[PDB]
PDB file of C-alpha atoms and ligand atoms in Angstrom:
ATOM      1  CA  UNK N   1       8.484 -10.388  16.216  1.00 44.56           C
ATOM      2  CA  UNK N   2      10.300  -7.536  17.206  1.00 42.74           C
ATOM      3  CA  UNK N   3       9.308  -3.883  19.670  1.00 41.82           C
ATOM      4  CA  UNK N   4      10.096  -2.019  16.286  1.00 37.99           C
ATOM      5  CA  UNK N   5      10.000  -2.721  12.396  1.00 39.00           C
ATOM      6  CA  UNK N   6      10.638   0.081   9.829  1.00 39.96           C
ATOM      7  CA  UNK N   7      11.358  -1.415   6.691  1.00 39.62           C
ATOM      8  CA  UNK N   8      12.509   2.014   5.447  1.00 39.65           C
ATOM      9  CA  UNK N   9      16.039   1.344   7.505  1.00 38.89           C
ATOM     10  CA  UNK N  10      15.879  -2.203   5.897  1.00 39.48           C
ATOM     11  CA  UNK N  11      16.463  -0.454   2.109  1.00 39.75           C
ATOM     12  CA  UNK N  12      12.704  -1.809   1.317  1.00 36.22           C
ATOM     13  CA  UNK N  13      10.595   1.528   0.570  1.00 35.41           C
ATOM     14  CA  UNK N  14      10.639   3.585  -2.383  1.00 34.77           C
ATOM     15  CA  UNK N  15      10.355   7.708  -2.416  1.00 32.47           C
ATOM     16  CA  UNK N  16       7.057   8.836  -1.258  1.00 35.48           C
ATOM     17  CA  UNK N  17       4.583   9.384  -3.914  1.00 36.82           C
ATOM     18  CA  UNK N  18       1.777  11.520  -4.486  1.00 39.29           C
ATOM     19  CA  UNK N  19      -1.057  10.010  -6.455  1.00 42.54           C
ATOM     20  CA  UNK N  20      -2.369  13.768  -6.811  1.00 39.62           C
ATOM     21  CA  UNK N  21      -6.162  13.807  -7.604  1.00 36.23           C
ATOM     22  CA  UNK N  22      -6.998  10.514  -8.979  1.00 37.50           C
ATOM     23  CA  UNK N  23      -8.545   7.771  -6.734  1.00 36.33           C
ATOM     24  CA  UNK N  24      -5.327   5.530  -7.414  1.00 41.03           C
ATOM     25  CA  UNK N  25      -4.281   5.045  -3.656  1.00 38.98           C
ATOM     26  CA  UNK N  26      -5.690   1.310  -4.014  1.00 38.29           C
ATOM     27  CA  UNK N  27      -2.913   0.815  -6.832  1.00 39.93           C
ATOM     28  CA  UNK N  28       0.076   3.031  -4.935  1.00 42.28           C
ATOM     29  CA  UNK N  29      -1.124   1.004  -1.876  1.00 42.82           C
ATOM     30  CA  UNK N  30      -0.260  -2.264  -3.812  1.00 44.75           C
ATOM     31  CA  UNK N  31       3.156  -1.262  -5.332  1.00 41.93           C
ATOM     32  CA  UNK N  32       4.530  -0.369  -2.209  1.00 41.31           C
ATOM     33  CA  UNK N  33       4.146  -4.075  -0.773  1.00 45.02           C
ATOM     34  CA  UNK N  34       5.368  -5.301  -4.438  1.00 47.84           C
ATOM     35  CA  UNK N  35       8.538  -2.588  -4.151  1.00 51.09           C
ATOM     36  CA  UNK N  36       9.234  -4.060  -0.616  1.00 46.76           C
ATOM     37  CA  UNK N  37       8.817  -8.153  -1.481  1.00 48.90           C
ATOM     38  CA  UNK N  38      11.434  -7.612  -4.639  1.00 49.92           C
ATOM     39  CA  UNK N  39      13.392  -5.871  -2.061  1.00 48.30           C
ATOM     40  CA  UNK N  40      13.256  -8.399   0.468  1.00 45.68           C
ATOM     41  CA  UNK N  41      13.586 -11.069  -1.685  1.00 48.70           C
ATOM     42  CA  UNK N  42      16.151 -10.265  -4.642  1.00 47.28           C
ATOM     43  CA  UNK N  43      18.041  -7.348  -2.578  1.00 51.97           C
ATOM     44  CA  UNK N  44      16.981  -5.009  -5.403  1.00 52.29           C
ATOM     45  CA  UNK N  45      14.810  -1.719  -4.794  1.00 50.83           C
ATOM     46  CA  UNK N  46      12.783  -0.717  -7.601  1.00 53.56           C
ATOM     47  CA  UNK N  47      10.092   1.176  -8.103  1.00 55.78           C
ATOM     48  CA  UNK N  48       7.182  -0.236 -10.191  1.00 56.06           C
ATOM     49  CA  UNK N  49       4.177   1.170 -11.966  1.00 56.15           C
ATOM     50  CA  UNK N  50       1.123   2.002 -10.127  1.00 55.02           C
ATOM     51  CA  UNK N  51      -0.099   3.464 -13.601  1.00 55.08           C
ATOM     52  CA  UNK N  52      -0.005  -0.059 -14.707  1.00 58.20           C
ATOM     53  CA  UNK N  53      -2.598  -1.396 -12.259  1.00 56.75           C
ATOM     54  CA  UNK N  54      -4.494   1.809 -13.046  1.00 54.73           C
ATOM     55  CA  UNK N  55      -4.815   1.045 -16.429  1.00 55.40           C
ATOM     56  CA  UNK N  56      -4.573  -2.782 -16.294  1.00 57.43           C
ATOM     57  CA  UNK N  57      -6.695  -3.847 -13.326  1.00 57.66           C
ATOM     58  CA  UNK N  58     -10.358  -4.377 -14.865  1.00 60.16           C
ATOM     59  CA  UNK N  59     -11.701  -5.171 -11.122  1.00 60.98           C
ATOM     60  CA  UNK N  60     -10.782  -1.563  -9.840  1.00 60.45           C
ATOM     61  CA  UNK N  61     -12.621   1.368 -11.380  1.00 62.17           C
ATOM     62  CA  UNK N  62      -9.302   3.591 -12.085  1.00 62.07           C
ATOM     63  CA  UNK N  63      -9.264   6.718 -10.685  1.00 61.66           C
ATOM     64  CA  UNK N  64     -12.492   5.942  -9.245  1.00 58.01           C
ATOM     65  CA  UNK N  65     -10.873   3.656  -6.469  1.00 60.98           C
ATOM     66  CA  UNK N  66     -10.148  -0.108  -6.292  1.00 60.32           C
ATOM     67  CA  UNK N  67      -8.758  -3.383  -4.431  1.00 60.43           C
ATOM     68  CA  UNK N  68      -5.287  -3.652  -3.300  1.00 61.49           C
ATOM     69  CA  UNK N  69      -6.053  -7.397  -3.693  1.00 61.27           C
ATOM     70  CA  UNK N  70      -7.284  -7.659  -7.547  1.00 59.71           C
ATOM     71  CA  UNK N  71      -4.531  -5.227  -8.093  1.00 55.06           C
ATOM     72  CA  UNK N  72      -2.086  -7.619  -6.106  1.00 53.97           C
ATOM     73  CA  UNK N  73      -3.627 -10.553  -7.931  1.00 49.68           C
ATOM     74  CA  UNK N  74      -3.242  -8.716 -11.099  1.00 55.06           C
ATOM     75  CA  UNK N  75       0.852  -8.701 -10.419  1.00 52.54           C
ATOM     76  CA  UNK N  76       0.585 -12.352  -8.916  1.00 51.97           C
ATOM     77  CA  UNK N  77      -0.850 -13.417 -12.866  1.00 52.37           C
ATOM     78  CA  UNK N  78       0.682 -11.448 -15.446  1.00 53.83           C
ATOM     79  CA  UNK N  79       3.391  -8.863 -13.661  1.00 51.57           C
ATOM     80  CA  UNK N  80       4.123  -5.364 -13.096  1.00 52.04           C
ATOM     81  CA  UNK N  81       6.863  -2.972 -15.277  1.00 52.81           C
ATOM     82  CA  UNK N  82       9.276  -0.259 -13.405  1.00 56.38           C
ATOM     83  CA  UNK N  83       7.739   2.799 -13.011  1.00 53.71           C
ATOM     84  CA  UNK N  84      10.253   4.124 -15.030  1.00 58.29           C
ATOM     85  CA  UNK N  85       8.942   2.329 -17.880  1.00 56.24           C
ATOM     86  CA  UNK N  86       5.279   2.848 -17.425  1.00 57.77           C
ATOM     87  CA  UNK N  87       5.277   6.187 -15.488  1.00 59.86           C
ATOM     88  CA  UNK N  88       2.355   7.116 -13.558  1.00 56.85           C
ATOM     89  CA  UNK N  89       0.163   9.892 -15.302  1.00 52.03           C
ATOM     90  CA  UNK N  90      -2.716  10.467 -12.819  1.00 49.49           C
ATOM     91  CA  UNK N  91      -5.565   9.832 -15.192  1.00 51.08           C
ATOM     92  CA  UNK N  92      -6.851   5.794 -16.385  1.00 50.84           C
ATOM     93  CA  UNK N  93      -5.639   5.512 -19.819  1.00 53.12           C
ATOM     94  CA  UNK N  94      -5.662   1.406 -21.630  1.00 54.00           C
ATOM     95  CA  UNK N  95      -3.580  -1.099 -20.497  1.00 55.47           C
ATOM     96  CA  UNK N  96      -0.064  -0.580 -22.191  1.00 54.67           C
ATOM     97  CA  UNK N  97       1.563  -3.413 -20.268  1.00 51.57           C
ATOM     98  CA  UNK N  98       2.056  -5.426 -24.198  1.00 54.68           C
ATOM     99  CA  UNK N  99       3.536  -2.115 -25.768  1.00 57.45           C
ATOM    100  CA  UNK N 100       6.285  -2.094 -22.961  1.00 55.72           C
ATOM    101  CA  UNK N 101       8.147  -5.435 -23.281  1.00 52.17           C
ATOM    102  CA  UNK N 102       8.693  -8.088 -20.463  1.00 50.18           C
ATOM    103  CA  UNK N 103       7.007  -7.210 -16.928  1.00 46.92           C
ATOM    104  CA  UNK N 104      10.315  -6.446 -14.663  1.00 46.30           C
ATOM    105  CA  UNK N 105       8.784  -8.391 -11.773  1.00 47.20           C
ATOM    106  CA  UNK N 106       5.880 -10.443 -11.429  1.00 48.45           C
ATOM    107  CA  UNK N 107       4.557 -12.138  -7.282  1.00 48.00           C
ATOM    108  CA  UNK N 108       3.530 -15.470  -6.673  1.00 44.18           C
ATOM    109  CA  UNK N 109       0.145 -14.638  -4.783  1.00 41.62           C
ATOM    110  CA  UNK N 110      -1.934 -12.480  -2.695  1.00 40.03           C
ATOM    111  CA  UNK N 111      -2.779 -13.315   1.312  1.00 42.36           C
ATOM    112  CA  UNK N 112      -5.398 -11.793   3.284  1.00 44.36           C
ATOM    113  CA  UNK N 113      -4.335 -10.741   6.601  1.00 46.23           C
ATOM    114  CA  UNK N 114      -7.310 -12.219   8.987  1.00 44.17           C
ATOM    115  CA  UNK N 115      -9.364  -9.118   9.749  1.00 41.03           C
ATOM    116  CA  UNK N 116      -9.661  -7.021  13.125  1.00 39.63           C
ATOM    117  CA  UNK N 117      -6.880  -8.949  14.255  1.00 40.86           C
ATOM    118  CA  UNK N 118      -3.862  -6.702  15.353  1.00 38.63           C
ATOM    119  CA  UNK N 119      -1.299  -8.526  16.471  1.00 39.76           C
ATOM    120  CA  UNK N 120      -2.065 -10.793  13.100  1.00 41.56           C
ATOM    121  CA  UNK N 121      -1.522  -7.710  10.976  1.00 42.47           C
ATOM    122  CA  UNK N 122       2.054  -7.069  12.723  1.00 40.98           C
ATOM    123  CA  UNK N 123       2.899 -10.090  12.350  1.00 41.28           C
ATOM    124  CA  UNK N 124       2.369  -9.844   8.847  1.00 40.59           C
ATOM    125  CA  UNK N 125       4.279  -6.408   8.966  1.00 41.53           C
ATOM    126  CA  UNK N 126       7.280  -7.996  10.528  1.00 40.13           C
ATOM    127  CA  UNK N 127       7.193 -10.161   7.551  1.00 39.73           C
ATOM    128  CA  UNK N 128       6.825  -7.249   4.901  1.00 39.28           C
ATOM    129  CA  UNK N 129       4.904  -4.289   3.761  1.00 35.69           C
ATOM    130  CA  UNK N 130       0.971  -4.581   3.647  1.00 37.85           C
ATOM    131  CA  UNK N 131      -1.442  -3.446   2.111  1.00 39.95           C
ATOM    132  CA  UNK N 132      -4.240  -1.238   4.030  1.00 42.58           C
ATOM    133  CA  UNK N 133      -6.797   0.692   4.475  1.00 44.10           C
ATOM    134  CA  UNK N 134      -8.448   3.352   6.827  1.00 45.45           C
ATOM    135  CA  UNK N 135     -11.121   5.904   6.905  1.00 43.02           C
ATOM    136  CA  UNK N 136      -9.180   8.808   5.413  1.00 43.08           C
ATOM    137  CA  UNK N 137     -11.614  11.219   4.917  1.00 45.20           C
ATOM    138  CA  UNK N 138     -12.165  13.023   8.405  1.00 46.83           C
ATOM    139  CA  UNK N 139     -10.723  16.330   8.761  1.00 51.04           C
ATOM    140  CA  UNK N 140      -8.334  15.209  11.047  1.00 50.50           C
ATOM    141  CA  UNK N 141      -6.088  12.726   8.909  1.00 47.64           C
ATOM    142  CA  UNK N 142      -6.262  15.302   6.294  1.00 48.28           C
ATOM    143  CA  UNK N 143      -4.288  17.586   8.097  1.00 48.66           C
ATOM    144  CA  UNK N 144      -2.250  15.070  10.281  1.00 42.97           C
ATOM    145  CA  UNK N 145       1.222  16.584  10.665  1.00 43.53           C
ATOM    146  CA  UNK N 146       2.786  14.461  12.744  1.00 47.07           C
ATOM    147  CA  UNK N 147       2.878  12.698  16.375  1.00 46.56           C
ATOM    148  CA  UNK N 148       0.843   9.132  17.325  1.00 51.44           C
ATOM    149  CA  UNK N 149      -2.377   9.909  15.443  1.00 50.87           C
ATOM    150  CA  UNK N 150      -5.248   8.781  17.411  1.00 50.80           C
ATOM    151  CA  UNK N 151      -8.109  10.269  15.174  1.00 49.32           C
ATOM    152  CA  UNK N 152     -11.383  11.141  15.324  1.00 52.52           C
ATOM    153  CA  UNK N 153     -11.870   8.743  12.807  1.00 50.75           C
ATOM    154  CA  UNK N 154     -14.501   5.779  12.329  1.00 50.10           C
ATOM    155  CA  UNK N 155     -13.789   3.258  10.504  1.00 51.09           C
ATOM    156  CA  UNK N 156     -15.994   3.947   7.008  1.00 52.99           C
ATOM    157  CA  UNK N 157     -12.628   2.876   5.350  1.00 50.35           C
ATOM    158  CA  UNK N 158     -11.933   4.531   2.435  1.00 51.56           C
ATOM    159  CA  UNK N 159      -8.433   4.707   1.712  1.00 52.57           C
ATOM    160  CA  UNK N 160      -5.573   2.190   0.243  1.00 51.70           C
ATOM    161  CA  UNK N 161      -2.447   2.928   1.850  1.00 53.35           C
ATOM    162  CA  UNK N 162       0.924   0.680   3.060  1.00 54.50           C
ATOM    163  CA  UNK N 163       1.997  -0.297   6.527  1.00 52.01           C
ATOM    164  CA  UNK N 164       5.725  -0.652   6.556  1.00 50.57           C
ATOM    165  CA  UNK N 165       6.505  -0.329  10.082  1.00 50.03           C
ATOM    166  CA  UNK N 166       5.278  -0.713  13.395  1.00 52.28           C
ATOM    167  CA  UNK N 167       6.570   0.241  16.918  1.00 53.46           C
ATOM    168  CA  UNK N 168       4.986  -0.440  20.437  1.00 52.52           C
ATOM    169  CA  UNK N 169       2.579   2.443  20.568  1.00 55.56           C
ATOM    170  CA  UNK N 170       1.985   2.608  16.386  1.00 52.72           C
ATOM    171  CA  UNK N 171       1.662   1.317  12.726  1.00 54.09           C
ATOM    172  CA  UNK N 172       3.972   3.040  10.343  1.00 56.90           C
ATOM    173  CA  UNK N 173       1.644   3.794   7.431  1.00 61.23           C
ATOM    174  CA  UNK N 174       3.196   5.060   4.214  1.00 63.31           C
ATOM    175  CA  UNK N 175       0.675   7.238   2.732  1.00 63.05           C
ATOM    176  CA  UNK N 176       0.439   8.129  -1.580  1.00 64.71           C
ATOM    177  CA  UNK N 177       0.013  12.012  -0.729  1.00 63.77           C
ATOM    178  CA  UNK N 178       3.285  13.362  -0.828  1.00 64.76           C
ATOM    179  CA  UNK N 179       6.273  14.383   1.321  1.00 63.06           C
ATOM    180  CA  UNK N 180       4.420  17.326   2.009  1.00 62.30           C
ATOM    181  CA  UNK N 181       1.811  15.435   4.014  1.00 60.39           C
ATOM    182  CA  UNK N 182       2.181  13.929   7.908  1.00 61.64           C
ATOM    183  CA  UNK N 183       5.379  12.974   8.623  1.00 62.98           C
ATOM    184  CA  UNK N 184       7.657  13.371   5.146  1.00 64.36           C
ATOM    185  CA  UNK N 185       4.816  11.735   3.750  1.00 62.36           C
ATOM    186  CA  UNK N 186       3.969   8.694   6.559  1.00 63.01           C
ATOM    187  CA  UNK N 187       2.081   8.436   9.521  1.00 60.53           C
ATOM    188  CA  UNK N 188       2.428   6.503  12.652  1.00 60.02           C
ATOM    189  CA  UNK N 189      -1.172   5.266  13.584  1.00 61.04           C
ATOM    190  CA  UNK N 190      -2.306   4.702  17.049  1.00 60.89           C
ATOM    191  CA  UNK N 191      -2.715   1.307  17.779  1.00 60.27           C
ATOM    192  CA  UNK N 192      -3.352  -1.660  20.980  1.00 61.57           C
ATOM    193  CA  UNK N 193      -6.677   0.216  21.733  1.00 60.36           C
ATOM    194  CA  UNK N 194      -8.311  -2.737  22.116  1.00 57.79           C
ATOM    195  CA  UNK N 195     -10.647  -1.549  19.027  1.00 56.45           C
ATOM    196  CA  UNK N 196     -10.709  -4.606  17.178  1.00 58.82           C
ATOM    197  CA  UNK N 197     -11.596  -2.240  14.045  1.00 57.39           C
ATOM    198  CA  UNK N 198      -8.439  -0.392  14.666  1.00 60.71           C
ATOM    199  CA  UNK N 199      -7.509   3.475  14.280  1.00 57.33           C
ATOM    200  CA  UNK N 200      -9.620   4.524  11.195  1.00 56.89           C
ATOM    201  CA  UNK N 201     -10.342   1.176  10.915  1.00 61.21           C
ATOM    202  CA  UNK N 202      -6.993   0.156  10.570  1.00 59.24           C
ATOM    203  CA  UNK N 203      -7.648  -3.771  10.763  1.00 59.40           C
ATOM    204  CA  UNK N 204     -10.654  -3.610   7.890  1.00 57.68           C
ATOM    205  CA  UNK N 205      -8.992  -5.439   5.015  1.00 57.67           C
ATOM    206  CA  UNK N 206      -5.112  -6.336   5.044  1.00 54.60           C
ATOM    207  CA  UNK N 207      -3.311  -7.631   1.596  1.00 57.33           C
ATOM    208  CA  UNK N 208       0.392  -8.737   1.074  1.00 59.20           C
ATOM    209  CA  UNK N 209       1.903 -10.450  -1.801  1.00 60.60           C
ATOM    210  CA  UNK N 210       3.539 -13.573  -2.199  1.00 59.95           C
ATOM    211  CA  UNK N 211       6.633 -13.897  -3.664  1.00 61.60           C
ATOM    212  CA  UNK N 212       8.258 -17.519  -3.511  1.00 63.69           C
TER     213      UNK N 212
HETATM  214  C1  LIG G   1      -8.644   5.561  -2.412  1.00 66.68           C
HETATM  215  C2  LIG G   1      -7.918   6.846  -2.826  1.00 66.68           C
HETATM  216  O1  LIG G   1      -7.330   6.892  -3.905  1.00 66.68           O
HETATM  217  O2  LIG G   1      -7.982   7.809  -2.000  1.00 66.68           O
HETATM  218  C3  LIG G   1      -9.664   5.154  -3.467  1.00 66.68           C
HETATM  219  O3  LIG G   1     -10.727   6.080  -3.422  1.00 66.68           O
HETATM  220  C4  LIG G   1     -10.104   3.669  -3.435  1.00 66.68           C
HETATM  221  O4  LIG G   1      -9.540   2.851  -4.152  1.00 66.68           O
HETATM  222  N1  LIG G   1     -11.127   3.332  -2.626  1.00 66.68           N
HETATM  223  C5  LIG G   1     -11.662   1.979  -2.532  1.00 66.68           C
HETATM  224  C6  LIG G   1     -11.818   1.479  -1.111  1.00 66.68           C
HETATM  225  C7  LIG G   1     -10.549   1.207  -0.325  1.00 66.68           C
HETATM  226  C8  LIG G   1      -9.713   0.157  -1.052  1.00 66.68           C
HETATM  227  C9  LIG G   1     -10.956   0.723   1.061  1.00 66.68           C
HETATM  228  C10 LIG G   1     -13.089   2.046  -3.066  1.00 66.68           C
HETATM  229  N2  LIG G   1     -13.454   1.106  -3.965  1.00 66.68           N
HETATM  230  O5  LIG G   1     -13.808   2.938  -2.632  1.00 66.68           O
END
């Protein structure tokens, strides 16, 4: 795999969104990898519904948090509408998926990246977007604003987001809390520390769909 990957310059990441106050970043974590599969895949970039895991994914407590996998298993069964169709709302309302036609898109699986592994996770980013998480919570990431962040953090992971990059020195994470946040919304995490964990805890728990 290649020194650098930013799937951004490869036409496979949507606008940064914010998922405002709602515990949703498990299902905005999720759409990004399913926006950047469709991409790399059918050469189209959509954007799809994280409203629809929200409201459709009976695993994940809504607004309350969830899994990036059951909500990647979720698309990998049934589908996933544009966002467009099902916007997001910030708040868990029923599952409308039935009231809004034929899903747009629908994956083939989920894969676990195997865990505290680093060079397993970029090889997985080299492949595509995937699904992460970190401890987001420390002061710290809150008010990252750019540069290699390096923490303090543990790794009490408690945060969905999207790794859709990588360079020697960093993981390009796409965050879900604005463009106002880090760096126009991303950050580029600190990693080969030898911390198996990873950054924040970086290398916790790893998801990417399948699409055949
Ligand atoms: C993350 C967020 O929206 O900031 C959520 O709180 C969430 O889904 N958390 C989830 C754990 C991560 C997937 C690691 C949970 N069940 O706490």
């Amino acid at each position: 795999i290649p020194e650098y990957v930013d799937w951004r310059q490869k036409g496979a990441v949507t606008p940064v969104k914010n998922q405002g106050s709602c515990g949703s970043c498990w299902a905005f974590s999720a759409v990004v990898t399913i926006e950047g599969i469709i991409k790399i895949r059918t050469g189209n970039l959509n954007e799809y519904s994280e409203q629809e895991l929200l409201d459709c994914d009976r695993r994940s407590y809504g607004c309350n948090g969830g899994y990036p996998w059951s909500a990647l298993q979720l698309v990998a069964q049934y589908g996933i509408h544009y966002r467009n169709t099902y916007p997001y709302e910030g708040v868990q309302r029923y599952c409308r998926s039935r009231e809004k036609g034929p899903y747009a898109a629908k994956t083939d699986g989920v894969r676990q990246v195997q865990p505290y592994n680093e060079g397993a996770l970029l090889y997985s980013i080299a492949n595509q977007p995937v699904s992460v998480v970190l401890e987001a919570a420390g002061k710290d990431f809150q008010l990252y604003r750019g540069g290699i962040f390096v923490g303090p953090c543990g790794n009490k992971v408690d945060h969905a987001v999207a790794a859709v990059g990588y360079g020697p020195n960093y993981i390009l994470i796409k965050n879900s809390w604005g463009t106002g946040w880090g760096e126009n919304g991303y950050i580029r995490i600190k990693r080969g520390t030898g911390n198996s964990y990873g950054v924040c805890g970086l290398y916790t728990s790893s998801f990417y769909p399948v699409k055949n």
